[PDB]
Amino acid sequence: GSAKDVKFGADARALMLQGVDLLADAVAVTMGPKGRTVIIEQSWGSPKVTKDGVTVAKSIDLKDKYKNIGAKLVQDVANNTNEEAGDGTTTATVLARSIAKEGFEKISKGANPVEIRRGVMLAVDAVIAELKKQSKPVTTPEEIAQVATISANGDKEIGNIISDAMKKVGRKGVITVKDGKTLNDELEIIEGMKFDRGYISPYFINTSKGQKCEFQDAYVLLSEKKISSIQSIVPALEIANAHRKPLVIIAEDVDGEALSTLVLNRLKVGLQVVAVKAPGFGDNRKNQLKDMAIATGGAVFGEEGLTLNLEDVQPHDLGKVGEVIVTKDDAMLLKGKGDKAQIEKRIQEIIEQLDVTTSEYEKEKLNERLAKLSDGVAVLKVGGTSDVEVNEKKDRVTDALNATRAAVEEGIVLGGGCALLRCIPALDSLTPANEDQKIGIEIIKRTLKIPAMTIAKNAGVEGSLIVEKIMQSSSEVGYDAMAGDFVNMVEKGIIDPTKVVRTALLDAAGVASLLTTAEVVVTEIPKE
Amino acid sequence: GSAKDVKFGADARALMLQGVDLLADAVAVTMGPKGRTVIIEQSWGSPKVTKDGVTVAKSIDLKDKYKNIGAKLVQDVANNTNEEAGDGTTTATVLARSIAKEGFEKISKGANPVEIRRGVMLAVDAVIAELKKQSKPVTTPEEIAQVATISANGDKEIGNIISDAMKKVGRKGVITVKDGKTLNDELEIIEGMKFDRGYISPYFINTSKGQKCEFQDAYVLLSEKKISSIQSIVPALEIANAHRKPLVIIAEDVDGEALSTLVLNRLKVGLQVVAVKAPGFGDNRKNQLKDMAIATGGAVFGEEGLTLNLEDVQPHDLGKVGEVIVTKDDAMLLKGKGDKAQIEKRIQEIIEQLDVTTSEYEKEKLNERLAKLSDGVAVLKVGGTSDVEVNEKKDRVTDALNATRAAVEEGIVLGGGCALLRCIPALDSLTPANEDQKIGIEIIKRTLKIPAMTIAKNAGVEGSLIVEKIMQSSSEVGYDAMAGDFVNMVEKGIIDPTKVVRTALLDAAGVASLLTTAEVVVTEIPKE
Amino acid sequence: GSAKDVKFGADARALMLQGVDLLADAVAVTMGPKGRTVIIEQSWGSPKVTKDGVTVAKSIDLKDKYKNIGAKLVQDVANNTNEEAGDGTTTATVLARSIAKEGFEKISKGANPVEIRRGVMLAVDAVIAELKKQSKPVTTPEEIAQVATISANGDKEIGNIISDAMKKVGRKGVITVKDGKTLNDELEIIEGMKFDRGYISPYFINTSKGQKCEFQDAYVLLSEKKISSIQSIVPALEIANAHRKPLVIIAEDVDGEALSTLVLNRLKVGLQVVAVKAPGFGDNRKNQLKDMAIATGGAVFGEEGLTLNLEDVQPHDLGKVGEVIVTKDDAMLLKGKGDKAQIEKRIQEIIEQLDVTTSEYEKEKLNERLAKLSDGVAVLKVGGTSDVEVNEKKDRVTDALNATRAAVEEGIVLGGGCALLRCIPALDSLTPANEDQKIGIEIIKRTLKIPAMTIAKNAGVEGSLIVEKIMQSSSEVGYDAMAGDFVNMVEKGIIDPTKVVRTALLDAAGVASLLTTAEVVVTEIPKE
């Protein structure tokens, strides 16, 4: 339907190389402890000052169609590396550019690009095997702090904050990051169960400070359906008054009749009672209701399974909470007097439901519920002066969290790009099946030095000399670019998650090797 | 999706410097007592003649994308300074331009911009600590008048007006500014409770002048619900007639039946009675109703809590007001015979609700209600001939109010920019961790002289010589630019709110240091 | 969002001065008795030939943004002068141009424009005080005729017409101006009460000429509600027939049943009765109904206050009118037999409601009702041949009316611009606080000669020489430009309202002084 432009041979390869080098030159200035930032113009408001590889990559589009194709492929590399590992986007970008450039000149009339790509994949598999062999697990929280600091552009405070959060909530807890209105970063831990549903009427407040409702050793009644009937809520009030204990009513909604009854009773006779809307809007609402039922110890009234009617409420059907506070925006429950066996079984059920399928939203909810049941969640308020600074620090903190999670899951290797450098001798033991596989192995061997050279170059020193000295040094000595000297990497804490390195290398090679097999390019003619 | 233009290194930095210099040159002519005004064309009507830094900054947009980026960053600086402190926008703008300019040449191949930024923040923290140490609190109203006069471009009348308003309403009262139709500024004080709800029917007027309804020692009946039934209003009239006292009915609305009853009775038997709509349209209506119930002393009929029906009204359920007037637009209640303990408890509840959360609208309503309860509010009618003069004087008056509030909250320091100048020796005691931190400290030290130099330059004298003489002077002697001589600031009343200075410096540094770390710029190609 | 063009220093000032000079040169040719007219093209129909300063000013817009800014400021001057005083728009325009031009060259590197503006305002205040001191009140109608003649471009007929109208309706009566279909101006006076509501059915006509309904000593029944029921109108007819007197039914509408009854009775038995719709469409309808009830003497049936039902009508509930005529378009009531005390009290109430607030419409209605009650209303039919001539004469007549009202309210001073000239010695007694205030005082002193110079220049003589001779003349001798010779102003009747002069000077100085403080001008780039 649309007329096309077709380009053959070396011209199209040169145009793709131009586009790829432009994108990777823009990205590569954000690599290493001495890397600089990139300012991307935002059409609506203030420009974004960022040091993230994938953010810079995704914001670059070129007018020329062939350079646009190269840019799109590099963007695919960066996006895959970001979505799989969460870090090492610039490393993947520079590796992709290096592989593409090295493979482009190796293409000749007699060369076989497909076999070159096969050899490249074979060499990458060997390098990944060596990386897995030479990695070591993470044991002490000091290594966690070191990994977080390295991934956060050498910020000690962020590393300490993340290490403290992981110590307090567990190495596989739920940690979230959001902007803070203050100057310095803050960490808060939410324990027990707390949901963003406040009290309905401003008449249950019985506190001097905070204008909240605080109860200790309180009854809890959970209703899956709404509360409107007089006889649907009176017997619970009778039980609470007879036992002389405060009562909480958590439901979808308390209707006007029951609201009037509760408010009138609390104002006249001083009956300690409060009402809270049920968190969640779908099946998650029912799951959370069952979760607080198990945690406090009781039953859900109005469930489709048993249909426990509210009229036949019993004193043993009400949960016991050690301390509950509810304010205008959210309510929390602490010290639920529930049996530990049922809580453990519910936790096992949640972890089992975490391992049946994925929907990009159900895993998050399951993790949230599990954290609320076991150890609570952690929230990081990222401080700053203006919006751009806060956004940049937030991106750095998210990168640090992703890298720390990867290091926990898989382990650590030498930082600074030396982990790939130590894998070069592993490539000397490979036997290519033919000349093209030899070419691919040589391409990967040459590419393995790219991250260290780029890191050294951003520091202002000659990358090749630093790489050569690293190779001629011991099996552990590496180069500290921030200090600018040859030091002990593991002692100085310059370490990287092995998952990030292997993922970046794998994705970059997988895309670049396929890219280097092109001979003919068809593009849409730029009519507009 | 949109093709981009990518610029590397010094060219993009030069373009940002051009944009920042243009915006800050436009803004900086509005600095000091001898600064001049800027005319901004308005698309709809008359142009705006303004001397406000943020107003000039936000109205400047540039065609070139990189100059636009620099302008947007400086606009962010000015906007943050305006929203946080309310004054010192031009100071923040000139500081931001100076920091960006000084940091741009310091960027080199071997320089580390991130460490330079870290050193800049360290130096700014030290300067802020010194500023906090050397500030002093505000004690006498004379200092309030001096601060208001300085912030209002040396206008004695505005300073005296603001000082009188704060004396008669309290240093933390509710003072608002609105345009006046006369030539000179006026100050009006509203005491007691007064809301913009006039009488419904023009038949309760019983005054010779003003065509209002005037009562003394009057009963007050407050109904949250509408008044329509005959039986819902008759017993209150019976109580009023038996006690032979005037009666006010404040409610959402008095319906036609009850209006007919009240009006016809008042016309026939001369029953002193008036009807007023309840102020507020949401929960604020209920809060205000409860507030006047506590102030006058009584109860709200029809509340959802107790549901005090109007049929069972008692003589002790009606509030007593010493003197109440109501006219076509608003009604005023004075001398409510309410118990002081309940009023104090309500005030405590208001101030507690002021300190739970923020919504940018609830704080204003809470402050309004608290002022109506305790001391009333003040309104400043800014006079003038045309609209442009009134707008300019209104901007100056708002700046004076913001500066006076900041001075009350935090304290005062030497004016004329010497407060930052005296902090230069504090920077000599800082030890940089490396060379880049030393560069950042030097940048901040050089930037600290910018406000005084700009103020002197706008006066027509050489800024550098004046700054040098100030540094070589005593620890207190400063330069009066309006008089143009070296004098005593604290004696002459040239003082500045320390909050304004510290906020402007902090925001300007925080944005400019981040800006000076750019190496690559991606902008949208100007297709249209 | 929109790219801006920013101009600094002398260039922007020069462009704004160019725009101001263009607009004021266009306006200033319409000044003095020998001034000429300006033709403004109307997009829809015939062009407007006008001699009004504000009409010429408001119709001028310039393509260049800076010249447009200057034109907008001069338009603000002219509009404020027109809306406040009603005359002296050209004087204000020329004063504004002179002040802006004089202040623009006084701006230098060392000058302080704000202090110059302060000195200008001080000098203007002194001049206004002198003008108020030297003015004299208006006592005789001859001065009224002189003022109207001077303000109407020296037209004796218009002055005599306005003087006669003010003699016959009072110096503060209601006089309106509307176009006439004849050649010469006419003055019509409406006495008593007359409203534009004619008889409904063409069956009550009982006159030989005019096809109206003429009655003497007639009963009047006023109903706020509609008349539809048979029993709602029969008893009034019984009373009228028993007393054998004509009857008028003034109501919102006489519906089909009652209208048919009235028509049938009047046609068969010759019952003298007529029906008229109530004037007004809102609360004004009720106010007018009450006013006719008070003037005639009676009550309004169906009012929401007392609800006087029409069934219980009494002979003392019907007003008595000496003569009532009603035609196809309007009805007139004369010689209402109402008690003078109630009429006086209603008049006092109307003047009191005139002094509570303003809504730009309610004052007009109150004045109309007061005039209808007390003395009547005057209407001026402005005659002419074509539409343009009628519009020009209408503009001149409105200017004369505004000037005469101002002279009545405040007083008169010497005309021809000598009133400002005599105020120059008052400026010699002012002591400036500094050099800039001295410059402002000199600017005002130089500007004070502009109106007389412009008036002389339009006459074809040298303005400077005429002004100089005026200054060296006596304290009363002035220059008649129309006669072109030096005479006695008060004897020759060349006088001006002091309010017009002071308002024009104040507004022009206030806007121009603010304009002369600009250093930077920011405009929107002309994209389209």
Ligand SMILES: Nc1ncnc2c1ncn2[C@@H]1O[C@H](COP(=O)(O)OP(=O)(O)O)[C@@H](O)[C@H]1O
């Ligand atoms: N002080 C240091 N000395 C040497 N290498 C470092 C130092 N700090 C960080 N690095 C290395 O630099 C890399 C950080 O690059 P980064 O900007 O995170 O790019 P990416 O996000 O693509 O990993 C890490 O792989 C780390 O090994």
Ligand SMILES: Nc1ncnc2c1ncn2[C@@H]1O[C@H](COP(=O)(O)OP(=O)(O)O)[C@@H](O)[C@H]1O
């Ligand atoms: N008479 C004076 N002599 C010396 N300095 C002054 C004088 N009046 C004001 N200043 C200084 O000038 C500054 C006023 O600048 P301003 O136009 O308010 O800019 P901003 O609104 O950004 O503070 C204040 O910081 C004050 O210290």
Ligand SMILES: Nc1ncnc2c1ncn2[C@@H]1O[C@H](COP(=O)(O)OP(=O)(O)O)[C@@H](O)[C@H]1O
């Ligand atoms: N015969 C005359 N001799 C001298 N001055 C006159 C004469 N007639 C009018 N003037 C002066 O000319 C002015 C009239 O100008 P006009 O066209 O009304 O401009 P504006 O509408 O701005 O007042 C008046 O101020 C009056 O004093």
Ligand code: BEF
């Ligand atoms: F470039 Be990654 F996001 F650290």
Ligand code: BEF
């Ligand atoms: F520049 Be600020 F608003 F005084």
Ligand code: BEF
């Ligand atoms: F110019 Be004015 F309307 F006489």
Ligand SMILES: [K+]
């Ligand atoms: K990066």
Ligand SMILES: [K+]
């Ligand atoms: K300013």
Ligand SMILES: [K+]
């Ligand atoms: K004119």
Ligand SMILES: [Mg+2]
């Ligand atoms: Mg990283």
Ligand SMILES: [Mg+2]
């Ligand atoms: Mg200020």
Ligand SMILES: [Mg+2]
């Ligand atoms: Mg005139």
